[PDB]
């Protein structure tokens, strides 16, 4: 401070079929996202894009971790090794592989995601929670 080496700045659902924007600003009030949701139409393809800056020194072993809950119950955990990054002017963007929102009535509904961004020193660069609501339609 007042500028940290690593600043997680944004999560984005990258979905071509989506009629509007699916972005969380992570420079803001993280607690708000929990009474919010992103809506996705069942079966659509998307990526998660995590935006982050490195401002001074090399960070090794950066790692994005998600846990998915449904109705408060853990249903999944995924890890993505992001890499080593040096400092530069522009944010870096990490994209997860393409996935499909679930499909079928029994899989529709809300899911909450606990997201963590970390490194090989186990620094908590940011942790945040958000929600995903799978619907029949937009």
Curated annotation (Swiss-Prot):
Keywords: Acetylation, Cytoplasm, Disease variant, GTPase activation, Isopeptide bond, Phosphoprotein, Ubl conjugation. One of its GO terms (cellular component) is Schaffer collateral - CA1 synapse. There is a cross-link at residues 74, 77 (Glycyl lysine isopeptide (Lys-Gly) (interchain with G-Cter in SUMO2)). There is a cross-link at residues 74, 77 (Glycyl lysine isopeptide (Lys-Gly) (interchain with G-Cter in SUMO1)). The modification N6-acetyllysine is found at residues 41, 63, 77, 114. It is found in: Cytoplasm. Its main location: cytoplasm. Coiled coil: none annotated. GO terms for biological process: negative regulation of apoptotic process; regulation of protein localization; regulation of Rho protein signal transduction; regulation of synaptic vesicle cycle; Rho protein signal transduction; semaphorin-plexin signaling pathway. The modification N6-succinyllysine is found at residue 77. One of its GO terms (molecular function) is Rho GDP-dissociation inhibitor activity. Monomer. Interacts with FER. Interacts with PLXNB3. Forms a heterodimer with RAC1. Interacts with RHOA, the affinity is increased by three orders of magnitude when RHOA is prenylated. Interacts with PSMD10; the interaction increases ARHGDIA association with RHOA, leading to ARHGDIA-mediated inactivation of RHOA and ROCK and prolonged AKT activation. Interacts with KANK2; the interaction is direct and may regulate the interaction of ARHGDIA with RHOA, RAC1 and CDC42. Interacts with RHOC. Interacts with CDC42. Interacts with NGFR (via death domain); NGFR binding decreases the affinity for RHOA. Controls Rho proteins homeostasis. Regulates the GDP/GTP exchange reaction of the Rho proteins by inhibiting the dissociation of GDP from them, and the subsequent binding of GTP to them. Retains Rho proteins such as CDC42, RAC1 and RHOA in an inactive cytosolic pool, regulating their stability and protecting them from degradation. Actively involved in the recycling and distribution of activated Rho GTPases in the cell, mediates extraction from membranes of both inactive and activated molecules due its exceptionally high affinity for prenylated forms. Belongs to the Rho GDI family. It is linked to Nephrotic syndrome 8: A form of nephrotic syndrome, a renal disease clinically characterized by progressive renal failure, severe proteinuria, hypoalbuminemia, hyperlipidemia and edema. Kidney biopsies show diffuse mesangial sclerosis, with small glomeruli, hypercellularity, increased extracellular matrix, and contracted/collapsed glomerular tufts surrounded by immature or abnormal podocytes. This is Rho GDP-dissociation inhibitor 1. It comes from Homo sapiens. The gene is ARHGDIA. The chain holds residues 67 to 202 of 204 of the full protein.
